[PDB]
Amino acid sequence: CTLWGAAGTASMEGSLLAKNRDWKPDHAQSLRLLHPEHGYAYLGLYADNGSEPGIKAGVNQKGLAVVAAEASSLPRALRGVLTRLLRDYGSLDEVASAADKLFAQARPVFLLLADAGGLMQVEIGQHGRYRLIRQQSGTLAHTNHYADTSLLDGAQTIGPSSQARLERIRFLLDQHPAHTLSEFERLSRDRHDGPDNSLWRSGREHTLAGWRIALPAGAPPRLQLTLANPGRAERDGDYALDSAFWAQPARTLLPK
Numbered sequence: 715c716t717l718w719g720a721a722g723t724a725s726m727e728g729s730l731l732a733k734n735r736d737w738k739p740d741h742a743q744s745l746r747l748l749h750p751e752h753g754y755a756y757l758g759l760y761a762d763n764g765s766e767p768g769i770k771a772g773v774n775q776k777g778l779a780v781v782a783a784e785a786s787s788l789p790r791a792l793r794g795v796l797t798r799l800l801r802d803y804g805s806l807d808e809v810a811s812a813a814d815k816l817f818a819q820a821r822p823v824f825l826l827l828a829d830a831g832g833l834m835q836v837e838i839g840q841h842g843r844y845r846l847i848r849q850q851s852g853t854l855a856h857t858n859h860y861a862d863t864s865l866l867d868g869a870q871t872i873g874p875s876s877q878a879r880l881e882r883i884r885f886l887l888d889q890h891p892a893h894t895l896s897e898f899e900r901l902s903r904d905r906h907d908g909p910d911n912s913l914w915r916s917g918r919e920h921t922l923a924g925w926r927i928a929l930p931a932g933a934p935p936r937l938q939l940t941l942a943n944p945g946r947a948e949r950d951g952d953y954a955l956d957s958a959f960w961a962q963p964a965r966t967l968l969p970k
Contacts (some may be wrong), residue, residue, distance in 0.1 A: 721831075727930055745758070751753035755775050780799050785854060793821070831850065939951040
């Protein structure tokens with residue numbers, strides 16, 4: 715998985731959060747809106763079935779968005795919280811506060827949250843150890859390996875794809891000063907470097923979805939999603955998370 719986003723003069727439509735979900739094409743995913751009994755309503759990029767079902771990404775009505783990356787760097791042995799964020803927190807500051815507990819008890823993982831204000835990257839290591847980064851007027855990017863090795867008990871294992879993919883969105887992003895949603899969409903479909911080391915994989919692992927959202931201040935958030943469930947044809951989502959959107963009943967919005 716490839717995660718990345720821009721904030722500040724680095725974007726022309728506000729905070730951008732993107733996520734490329736890569737995985738063995740052996741399950742089905744779905745975009746679901748949920749109205750939890752206690753918390754904010756939120757959209758979710760669920761993995762209906764498979765080996766690891768659950769929320770892979772989302773965004774709530776308060777306009778807080780988050781995307782996760784698996785921490786393959788370390789053994790499955792040492793390898794949720796994505797839902798707490800979506801249904802109890804409405805801003806990066808809300809998270810920066812309850813972070814030393816929210817993440818101090820979160821399994822290892824890579825998180826990339828975003829809100830009208832900016833972006834925030836969270837790397838949760840072995841046990842409790844976690845590093846934070848908050849950019850407000852620039853760009854951010856992360857894949858499947860820790861940038862701060864200090865958050866682990868021992869040297870990690872960087873996968874060839876996590877390596878290559880990180881160097882690709884890093885390069886492509888460093889070309890222009892500012893970015894847009896339209897651009898990102900093009901970015902997520904880059905087929906540079908074979909079928910395994912590319913942003914849009916198609917080898918052992920296929921990119922099963924493309925997630926991208928824009929969060930302009932004082933305006934409805936705009937979400938675009940490309941679902942690619944194996945066997946089915948590609949389905950694309952384009953929504954405006956306004957008051958009305960969130961008012962609709964909880965149900966699957968992808969695939970129709």
